[PDB]
Amino acid sequence: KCVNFNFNGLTGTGVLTESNKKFLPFQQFGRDIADTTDAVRDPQTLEI
Amino acid sequence: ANQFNSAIGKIQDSLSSTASALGKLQDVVNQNAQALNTLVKQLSSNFG
């Protein structure tokens, strides 16, 4: 669903979808070459 | 017959070995890709 998502770092619109991407355990947020956040880790649990 | 067929065979070796002959069409994609990436990066600036 397309909803407003804010986890501690940003307020924007987008759709959350599970993928096979893998992030380092010490990494939280990530961005593409366009300087837009394409992924957010769940604060409580481990999810990408 | 031997001159025409041999000249066509040199085209396959020229495009495979030398990739700079097609750079005229590569600049069209580069100027378009850099201009779009430039227009996006302005959103992160505070503009004073």
Curated annotation (Swiss-Prot), chain A:
Top-rank taxon: Viruses
Function according to Swiss-Prot or TrEMBL: Attaches the virion to the cell membrane by interacting with host receptor, initiating the infection. The major receptor is host ACE2. When S2/S2' has been cleaved, binding to the receptor triggers direct fusion at the cell membrane. When S2/S2' has not been cleaved, binding to the receptor results in internalization of the virus by endocytosis using host TFRC and GRM2 and leading to fusion of the virion membrane with the host endosomal membrane. Alternatively, may use NRP1/NRP2 and integrin as entry receptors.
Quaternary context: Binds to host ACE2. RBD also interacts with the N-linked glycan on 'Asn-90' of ACE2. Cleavage of S generates a polybasic C-terminal sequence on S1 that binds to host Neuropilin-1 (NRP1) and Neuropilin-2 (NRP2) receptors. Interacts with host integrin alpha-5/beta-1 (ITGA5:ITGB1) and with ACE2 in complex with integrin alpha-5/beta-1 (ITGA5:ITGB1). May interact via cytoplasmic c-terminus with M protein. May interact (via N-terminus) with host bilirubin and biliverdin, thereby preventing antibody binding to the SARS-CoV-2 spike NTD via an allosteric mechanism.
Protein's name according to its UniProt entry: Spike protein S1
Annotated source species: Severe acute respiratory syndrome coronavirus 2
Gene: S
Residues of the full protein shown: 537 to 584 of 1273
Swiss-Prot record, chain B:
Effect ascribed to mutating residue 31 to H: In strain: Omicron/BA.1, Omicron/BA.2, Omicron/BA.2.12.1, Omicron/BA.2.75, Omicron/BA.4, Omicron/BA.5, Omicron/BQ.1.1, Omicron/XBB.1.5, Omicron/EG.5.1
Region entry Heptad repeat 1, spans: 1-47
Effect of residue 27 to N: In strain: Delta/B.1.617.2, Mu/B.1.621
Organism superkingdom: Viruses
Function: Subunit of the fusion protein that is processed upon entry into the host cell. Mediates fusion of the virion and cellular membranes by functioning as a class I viral fusion protein. Contains a viral fusion peptide that is unmasked after S2 cleavage. This cleavage can occur at the cell membrane by host TMPRSS2 or during endocytosis by host CSTL. In either case, this triggers an extensive and irreversible conformational change that leads to fusion of the viral envelope with the cellular cytoplasmic membrane, releasing viral genomic RNA into the host cell cytoplasm.
Protein name: Spike protein S2'
Shown part of the complete sequence: 924 to 971 of 1273
